[PDB]
């Protein structure tokens, strides 16, 4: 037995990092994490505050602060994300989940 994780991105259009970066044109001044790191780690900006979603697993995160690693938060909250696993690797995700 065992269902399989689907391969289709939640938002295929936001699969381009370049386009993900564009969405952070209004990423707030009181925000504390750089758009480039966020966009690199699969996230694009939604709304007018500091909410982001991953283009693939659609994991939603907000309340970002100075020192938050987008790749680490990605692995903390959405470990089965296929974009995350292909980018950072099995060992990286396992490491964040254990600790």
Nearer to Zn ion, 30 or 60 (CB): 60
Nearer to Zn ion, 14 or 57 (CB): 57
Polymer length of the chain: 99
**Least distance in angstroms from the C-beta of 41 to Zn ion:** 8
The residue ranges that bind Zn ion (CB under 5 A) are: 42, 54, 56-57, 59, 78, 81
**Least distance in angstroms from the C-beta of 49 to Zn ion:** 20
Is 94 known as a binding-site position? no
Give one DSSP letter per residue of 34-86, joined into a string: -HHHHHHTTEEEETTTTEEEETTT--EE----TT--HHHHHHHH-TT-HHHHH
Is 48 known as a binding-site position? no
């Amino acid at each position: 037995a065992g269902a399989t994780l689907s391969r289709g991105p939640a938002f295929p259009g936001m699969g381009s990092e370049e386009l993900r970066l564009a969405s952070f044109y209004d990423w707030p001044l009181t925000a504390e994490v750089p758009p480039e790191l966020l966009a690199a780690a699969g996230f694009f900006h939604t709304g007018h505050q500091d909410k982001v979603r991953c283009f693939f697993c659609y994991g939603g995160l907000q309340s970002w602060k100075r020192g938050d690693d987008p790749w680490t938060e990605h692995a903390k909250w959405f470990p089965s994300c296929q974009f995350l696993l292909r980018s950072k690797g099995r060992d990286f995700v396992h490491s964040v989940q254990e600790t």
